[PDB]
PDB file of all heavy atoms in Angstrom:
ATOM      1  N   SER A 155      82.113  58.905  19.952  1.00  0.00           N
ATOM      2  CA  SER A 155      82.098  57.330  20.027  1.00  0.00           C
ATOM      3  C   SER A 155      83.568  56.855  19.844  1.00  0.00           C
ATOM      4  O   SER A 155      84.026  56.391  18.767  1.00  0.00           O
ATOM      5  CB  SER A 155      81.224  56.693  19.006  1.00  0.00           C
ATOM      6  OG  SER A 155      79.816  57.315  19.241  1.00  0.00           O
ATOM      7  N   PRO A 156      84.379  56.848  20.934  1.00  0.00           N
ATOM      8  CA  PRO A 156      85.804  56.452  20.861  1.00  0.00           C
ATOM      9  C   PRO A 156      85.773  54.778  20.703  1.00  0.00           C
ATOM     10  O   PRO A 156      84.853  54.106  20.959  1.00  0.00           O
ATOM     11  CB  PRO A 156      86.295  56.798  22.156  1.00  0.00           C
ATOM     12  CG  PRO A 156      85.148  56.614  23.127  1.00  0.00           C
ATOM     13  CD  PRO A 156      83.997  57.221  22.291  1.00  0.00           C
ATOM     14  N   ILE A 157      86.975  54.343  20.230  1.00  0.00           N
ATOM     15  CA  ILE A 157      87.126  52.966  19.922  1.00  0.00           C
ATOM     16  C   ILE A 157      88.106  52.356  20.965  1.00  0.00           C
ATOM     17  O   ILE A 157      89.169  53.001  21.217  1.00  0.00           O
ATOM     18  CB  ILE A 157      87.607  52.788  18.487  1.00  0.00           C
ATOM     19  CG1 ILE A 157      86.387  53.329  17.488  1.00  0.00           C
ATOM     20  CG2 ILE A 157      87.935  51.341  18.206  1.00  0.00           C
ATOM     21  CD1 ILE A 157      86.743  53.499  16.031  1.00  0.00           C
ATOM     22  N   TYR A 158      87.673  51.215  21.580  1.00  0.00           N
ATOM     23  CA  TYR A 158      88.446  50.717  22.781  1.00  0.00           C
ATOM     24  C   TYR A 158      88.896  49.208  22.245  1.00  0.00           C
ATOM     25  O   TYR A 158      88.161  48.483  21.702  1.00  0.00           O
ATOM     26  CB  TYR A 158      87.569  50.507  24.021  1.00  0.00           C
ATOM     27  CG  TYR A 158      88.274  50.523  25.369  1.00  0.00           C
ATOM     28  CD1 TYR A 158      87.480  50.614  26.609  1.00  0.00           C
ATOM     29  CD2 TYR A 158      89.588  50.507  25.528  1.00  0.00           C
ATOM     30  CE1 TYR A 158      88.103  50.544  27.872  1.00  0.00           C
ATOM     31  CE2 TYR A 158      90.261  50.477  26.747  1.00  0.00           C
ATOM     32  CZ  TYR A 158      89.527  50.543  27.949  1.00  0.00           C
ATOM     33  OH  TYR A 158      90.261  50.694  29.056  1.00  0.00           O
ATOM     34  N   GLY A 159      90.182  48.852  22.423  1.00  0.00           N
ATOM     35  CA  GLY A 159      90.630  47.568  22.317  1.00  0.00           C
ATOM     36  C   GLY A 159      90.660  46.888  23.656  1.00  0.00           C
ATOM     37  O   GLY A 159      91.800  46.874  24.155  1.00  0.00           O
ATOM     38  N   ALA A 160      89.636  46.397  24.057  1.00  0.00           N
ATOM     39  CA  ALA A 160      89.359  45.698  25.346  1.00  0.00           C
ATOM     40  C   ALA A 160      89.411  44.338  25.365  1.00  0.00           C
ATOM     41  O   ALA A 160      89.077  43.648  24.393  1.00  0.00           O
ATOM     42  CB  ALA A 160      88.161  46.287  25.978  1.00  0.00           C
ATOM     43  N   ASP A 161      89.705  43.671  26.474  1.00  0.00           N
ATOM     44  CA  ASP A 161      89.547  42.268  26.851  1.00  0.00           C
ATOM     45  C   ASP A 161      90.368  41.367  25.963  1.00  0.00           C
ATOM     46  O   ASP A 161      89.755  40.314  25.345  1.00  0.00           O
ATOM     47  CB  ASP A 161      88.076  41.912  26.862  1.00  0.00           C
ATOM     48  CG  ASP A 161      87.159  42.617  27.831  1.00  0.00           C
ATOM     49  OD1 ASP A 161      87.709  42.650  28.996  1.00  0.00           O
ATOM     50  OD2 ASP A 161      86.035  42.999  27.538  1.00  0.00           O
ATOM     51  N   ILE A 162      91.518  41.628  25.653  1.00  0.00           N
ATOM     52  CA  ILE A 162      92.476  40.964  24.651  1.00  0.00           C
ATOM     53  C   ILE A 162      93.305  39.972  25.561  1.00  0.00           C
ATOM     54  O   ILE A 162      94.193  40.408  26.284  1.00  0.00           O
ATOM     55  CB  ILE A 162      93.344  41.913  23.961  1.00  0.00           C
ATOM     56  CG1 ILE A 162      92.483  42.800  22.977  1.00  0.00           C
ATOM     57  CG2 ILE A 162      94.320  41.157  23.113  1.00  0.00           C
ATOM     58  CD1 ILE A 162      93.236  43.881  22.586  1.00  0.00           C
ATOM     59  N   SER A 163      93.106  38.687  25.416  1.00  0.00           N
ATOM     60  CA  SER A 163      93.959  37.714  26.276  1.00  0.00           C
ATOM     61  C   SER A 163      95.315  37.963  25.904  1.00  0.00           C
ATOM     62  O   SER A 163      95.780  37.851  24.772  1.00  0.00           O
ATOM     63  CB  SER A 163      93.473  36.273  26.107  1.00  0.00           C
ATOM     64  OG  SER A 163      92.108  36.064  26.647  1.00  0.00           O
ATOM     65  N   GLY A 164      96.193  38.146  26.940  1.00  0.00           N
ATOM     66  CA  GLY A 164      97.652  38.193  26.764  1.00  0.00           C
ATOM     67  C   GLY A 164      98.305  38.936  27.818  1.00  0.00           C
ATOM     68  O   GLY A 164      97.663  39.394  28.828  1.00  0.00           O
ATOM     69  N   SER A 165      99.655  39.107  27.689  1.00  0.00           N
ATOM     70  CA  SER A 165     100.453  39.782  28.774  1.00  0.00           C
ATOM     71  C   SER A 165     101.575  40.493  28.234  1.00  0.00           C
ATOM     72  O   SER A 165     102.180  40.104  27.140  1.00  0.00           O
ATOM     73  CB  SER A 165     100.928  38.873  29.810  1.00  0.00           C
ATOM     74  OG  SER A 165     101.631  39.454  31.006  1.00  0.00           O
ATOM     75  N   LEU A 166     101.911  41.723  28.768  1.00  0.00           N
ATOM     76  CA  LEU A 166     103.078  42.363  28.368  1.00  0.00           C
ATOM     77  C   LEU A 166     104.169  42.330  29.368  1.00  0.00           C
ATOM     78  O   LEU A 166     105.229  43.074  29.251  1.00  0.00           O
ATOM     79  CB  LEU A 166     102.770  43.889  27.975  1.00  0.00           C
ATOM     80  CG  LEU A 166     102.118  44.115  26.678  1.00  0.00           C
ATOM     81  CD1 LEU A 166     101.610  45.533  26.492  1.00  0.00           C
ATOM     82  CD2 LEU A 166     102.969  43.700  25.557  1.00  0.00           C
ATOM     83  N   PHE A 167     104.057  41.523  30.421  1.00  0.00           N
ATOM     84  CA  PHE A 167     105.051  41.378  31.474  1.00  0.00           C
ATOM     85  C   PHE A 167     106.197  40.463  30.886  1.00  0.00           C
ATOM     86  O   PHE A 167     105.897  39.365  30.301  1.00  0.00           O
ATOM     87  CB  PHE A 167     104.533  40.905  32.691  1.00  0.00           C
ATOM     88  CG  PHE A 167     103.815  41.829  33.466  1.00  0.00           C
ATOM     89  CD1 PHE A 167     102.499  41.985  33.429  1.00  0.00           C
ATOM     90  CD2 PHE A 167     104.517  42.636  34.519  1.00  0.00           C
ATOM     91  CE1 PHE A 167     101.911  43.035  33.991  1.00  0.00           C
ATOM     92  CE2 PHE A 167     103.818  43.598  35.173  1.00  0.00           C
ATOM     93  CZ  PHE A 167     102.488  43.837  35.064  1.00  0.00           C
ATOM     94  N   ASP A 168     107.400  40.852  31.141  1.00  0.00           N
ATOM     95  CA  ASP A 168     108.571  39.906  30.690  1.00  0.00           C
ATOM     96  C   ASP A 168     108.492  38.730  31.538  1.00  0.00           C
ATOM     97  O   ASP A 168     108.241  38.833  32.797  1.00  0.00           O
ATOM     98  CB  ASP A 168     109.867  40.721  30.850  1.00  0.00           C
ATOM     99  CG  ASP A 168     111.075  39.990  30.356  1.00  0.00           C
ATOM    100  OD1 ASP A 168     111.329  38.935  30.634  1.00  0.00           O
ATOM    101  OD2 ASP A 168     111.961  40.824  29.757  1.00  0.00           O
ATOM    102  N   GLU A 169     108.678  37.578  30.977  1.00  0.00           N
ATOM    103  CA  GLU A 169     108.756  36.399  31.817  1.00  0.00           C
ATOM    104  C   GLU A 169     109.828  36.470  32.842  1.00  0.00           C
ATOM    105  O   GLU A 169     109.618  35.701  33.892  1.00  0.00           O
ATOM    106  CB  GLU A 169     108.907  35.065  30.927  1.00  0.00           C
ATOM    107  CG  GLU A 169     110.232  34.847  30.432  1.00  0.00           C
ATOM    108  CD  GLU A 169     110.381  33.501  29.565  1.00  0.00           C
ATOM    109  OE1 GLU A 169     109.386  32.735  29.346  1.00  0.00           O
ATOM    110  OE2 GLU A 169     111.494  33.312  29.285  1.00  0.00           O
ATOM    111  N   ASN A 170     110.745  37.164  32.711  1.00  0.00           N
ATOM    112  CA  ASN A 170     111.781  37.330  33.863  1.00  0.00           C
ATOM    113  C   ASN A 170     111.405  38.310  34.934  1.00  0.00           C
ATOM    114  O   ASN A 170     112.210  38.334  35.936  1.00  0.00           O
ATOM    115  CB  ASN A 170     113.092  37.730  33.207  1.00  0.00           C
ATOM    116  CG  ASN A 170     113.666  36.555  32.299  1.00  0.00           C
ATOM    117  OD1 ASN A 170     113.638  35.346  32.639  1.00  0.00           O
ATOM    118  ND2 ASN A 170     114.072  36.889  31.079  1.00  0.00           N
ATOM    119  N   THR A 171     110.372  38.986  34.783  1.00  0.00           N
ATOM    120  CA  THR A 171     109.905  39.908  35.924  1.00  0.00           C
ATOM    121  C   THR A 171     109.181  38.955  36.943  1.00  0.00           C
ATOM    122  O   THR A 171     108.170  38.429  36.599  1.00  0.00           O
ATOM    123  CB  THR A 171     108.887  40.919  35.340  1.00  0.00           C
ATOM    124  OG1 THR A 171     109.582  41.715  34.440  1.00  0.00           O
ATOM    125  CG2 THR A 171     108.406  41.801  36.473  1.00  0.00           C
ATOM    126  N   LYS A 172     109.845  38.870  38.126  1.00  0.00           N
ATOM    127  CA  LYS A 172     109.386  37.937  39.084  1.00  0.00           C
ATOM    128  C   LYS A 172     108.390  38.596  40.106  1.00  0.00           C
ATOM    129  O   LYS A 172     107.618  37.702  40.646  1.00  0.00           O
ATOM    130  CB  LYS A 172     110.493  37.382  39.915  1.00  0.00           C
ATOM    131  CG  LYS A 172     111.517  36.447  38.987  1.00  0.00           C
ATOM    132  CD  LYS A 172     110.784  35.616  37.909  1.00  0.00           C
ATOM    133  CE  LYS A 172     111.789  34.817  37.066  1.00  0.00           C
ATOM    134  NZ  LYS A 172     110.943  33.921  36.130  1.00  0.00           N
ATOM    135  N   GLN A 173     108.275  39.870  40.284  1.00  0.00           N
ATOM    136  CA  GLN A 173     107.570  40.547  41.187  1.00  0.00           C
ATOM    137  C   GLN A 173     106.252  41.134  40.548  1.00  0.00           C
ATOM    138  O   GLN A 173     106.505  41.893  39.470  1.00  0.00           O
ATOM    139  CB  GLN A 173     108.306  41.604  41.964  1.00  0.00           C
ATOM    140  CG  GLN A 173     109.692  41.069  42.715  1.00  0.00           C
ATOM    141  CD  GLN A 173     110.375  42.316  43.206  1.00  0.00           C
ATOM    142  OE1 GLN A 173     110.614  43.270  42.560  1.00  0.00           O
ATOM    143  NE2 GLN A 173     110.859  42.185  44.538  1.00  0.00           N
ATOM    144  N   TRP A 174     105.166  40.882  41.021  1.00  0.00           N
ATOM    145  CA  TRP A 174     103.948  41.541  40.521  1.00  0.00           C
ATOM    146  C   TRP A 174     103.665  41.403  39.074  1.00  0.00           C
ATOM    147  O   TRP A 174     103.293  42.344  38.366  1.00  0.00           O
ATOM    148  CB  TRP A 174     103.891  43.002  40.978  1.00  0.00           C
ATOM    149  CG  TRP A 174     103.676  43.150  42.517  1.00  0.00           C
ATOM    150  CD1 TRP A 174     104.318  42.595  43.594  1.00  0.00           C
ATOM    151  CD2 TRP A 174     102.528  43.872  43.115  1.00  0.00           C
ATOM    152  NE1 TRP A 174     103.787  42.965  44.822  1.00  0.00           N
ATOM    153  CE2 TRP A 174     102.651  43.804  44.545  1.00  0.00           C
ATOM    154  CE3 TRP A 174     101.497  44.700  42.706  1.00  0.00           C
ATOM    155  CZ2 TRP A 174     101.750  44.450  45.448  1.00  0.00           C
ATOM    156  CZ3 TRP A 174     100.667  45.353  43.527  1.00  0.00           C
ATOM    157  CH2 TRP A 174     100.746  45.111  44.897  1.00  0.00           C
ATOM    158  N   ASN A 175     104.009  40.215  38.563  1.00  0.00           N
ATOM    159  CA  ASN A 175     103.917  39.874  37.196  1.00  0.00           C
ATOM    160  C   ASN A 175     102.444  39.311  37.043  1.00  0.00           C
ATOM    161  O   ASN A 175     102.143  38.250  37.663  1.00  0.00           O
ATOM    162  CB  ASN A 175     104.888  38.812  36.803  1.00  0.00           C
ATOM    163  CG  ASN A 175     104.765  38.467  35.336  1.00  0.00           C
ATOM    164  OD1 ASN A 175     103.691  38.297  34.835  1.00  0.00           O
ATOM    165  ND2 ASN A 175     105.960  38.122  34.663  1.00  0.00           N
ATOM    166  N   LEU A 176     101.571  39.931  36.437  1.00  0.00           N
ATOM    167  CA  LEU A 176     100.190  39.594  36.457  1.00  0.00           C
ATOM    168  C   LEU A 176      99.796  38.432  35.590  1.00  0.00           C
ATOM    169  O   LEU A 176      98.780  37.904  35.749  1.00  0.00           O
ATOM    170  CB  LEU A 176      99.272  40.822  35.909  1.00  0.00           C
ATOM    171  CG  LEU A 176      99.487  42.073  36.698  1.00  0.00           C
ATOM    172  CD1 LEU A 176      98.356  43.060  36.229  1.00  0.00           C
ATOM    173  CD2 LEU A 176      99.425  41.920  38.154  1.00  0.00           C
ATOM    174  N   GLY A 177     100.867  37.834  34.862  1.00  0.00           N
ATOM    175  CA  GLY A 177     100.675  36.514  34.266  1.00  0.00           C
ATOM    176  C   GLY A 177     101.190  35.434  35.210  1.00  0.00           C
ATOM    177  O   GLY A 177     101.053  34.192  34.731  1.00  0.00           O
ATOM    178  N   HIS A 178     101.754  35.730  36.384  1.00  0.00           N
ATOM    179  CA  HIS A 178     102.323  34.625  37.231  1.00  0.00           C
ATOM    180  C   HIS A 178     101.651  34.674  38.587  1.00  0.00           C
ATOM    181  O   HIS A 178     102.252  34.168  39.600  1.00  0.00           O
ATOM    182  CB  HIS A 178     103.761  34.857  37.526  1.00  0.00           C
ATOM    183  CG  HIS A 178     104.567  34.672  36.356  1.00  0.00           C
ATOM    184  ND1 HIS A 178     105.941  35.067  36.220  1.00  0.00           N
ATOM    185  CD2 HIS A 178     104.277  34.247  35.025  1.00  0.00           C
ATOM    186  CE1 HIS A 178     106.376  34.726  35.110  1.00  0.00           C
ATOM    187  NE2 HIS A 178     105.421  34.283  34.341  1.00  0.00           N
ATOM    188  N   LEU A 179     100.509  35.200  38.750  1.00  0.00           N
ATOM    189  CA  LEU A 179      99.810  35.241  40.022  1.00  0.00           C
ATOM    190  C   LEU A 179      99.276  33.804  40.345  1.00  0.00           C
ATOM    191  O   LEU A 179      98.962  33.109  39.431  1.00  0.00           O
ATOM    192  CB  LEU A 179      98.619  36.170  40.186  1.00  0.00           C
ATOM    193  CG  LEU A 179      98.965  37.656  39.940  1.00  0.00           C
ATOM    194  CD1 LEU A 179      97.729  38.427  40.065  1.00  0.00           C
ATOM    195  CD2 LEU A 179     100.108  38.126  40.843  1.00  0.00           C
ATOM    196  N   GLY A 180      99.017  33.529  41.680  1.00  0.00           N
ATOM    197  CA  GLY A 180      98.279  32.380  42.059  1.00  0.00           C
ATOM    198  C   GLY A 180      96.828  32.482  41.537  1.00  0.00           C
ATOM    199  O   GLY A 180      96.270  33.498  41.455  1.00  0.00           O
ATOM    200  N   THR A 181      96.313  31.272  41.104  1.00  0.00           N
ATOM    201  CA  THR A 181      95.050  31.284  40.404  1.00  0.00           C
ATOM    202  C   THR A 181      93.930  31.284  41.432  1.00  0.00           C
ATOM    203  O   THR A 181      93.976  30.883  42.540  1.00  0.00           O
ATOM    204  CB  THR A 181      94.886  30.157  39.488  1.00  0.00           C
ATOM    205  OG1 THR A 181      94.717  28.911  40.276  1.00  0.00           O
ATOM    206  CG2 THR A 181      96.101  29.889  38.425  1.00  0.00           C
ATOM    207  N   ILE A 182      92.785  31.854  40.921  1.00  0.00           N
ATOM    208  CA  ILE A 182      91.549  31.789  41.764  1.00  0.00           C
ATOM    209  C   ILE A 182      91.114  30.388  42.066  1.00  0.00           C
ATOM    210  O   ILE A 182      90.530  30.163  43.077  1.00  0.00           O
ATOM    211  CB  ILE A 182      90.418  32.587  41.114  1.00  0.00           C
ATOM    212  CG1 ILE A 182      90.717  34.106  40.866  1.00  0.00           C
ATOM    213  CG2 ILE A 182      89.160  32.462  41.885  1.00  0.00           C
ATOM    214  CD1 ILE A 182      89.920  34.598  39.834  1.00  0.00           C
ATOM    215  N   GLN A 183      91.310  29.558  41.121  1.00  0.00           N
ATOM    216  CA  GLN A 183      90.931  28.093  41.308  1.00  0.00           C
ATOM    217  C   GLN A 183      91.738  27.453  42.435  1.00  0.00           C
ATOM    218  O   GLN A 183      91.303  26.782  43.249  1.00  0.00           O
ATOM    219  CB  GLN A 183      91.042  27.350  40.052  1.00  0.00           C
ATOM    220  CG  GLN A 183      90.112  27.684  38.958  1.00  0.00           C
ATOM    221  CD  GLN A 183      90.450  28.911  38.163  1.00  0.00           C
ATOM    222  OE1 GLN A 183      91.637  29.391  38.196  1.00  0.00           O
ATOM    223  NE2 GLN A 183      89.502  29.505  37.405  1.00  0.00           N
TER     224      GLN A 183
END
């Protein structure tokens, strides 16, 4: 029975990473 830290809101992309930064994508809305 392994232990998973899943579904934690947040980002590890540096704000200065401009390409493929998963916190800066166009929104689904």
Side-chain angles (χ1 to χ4, degrees):
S155 301
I157 295 169
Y158 207 172
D161 293 317
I162 297 161
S163 290
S165 186
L166 290 172
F167 285 87
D168 186 314
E169 74 179 5
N170 295 318
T171 297
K172 297 322 179 175
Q173 299 171 318
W174 289 54
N175 179 325
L176 298 191
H178 296 169
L179 301 180
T181 72
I182 300 158
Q183 296 75 22

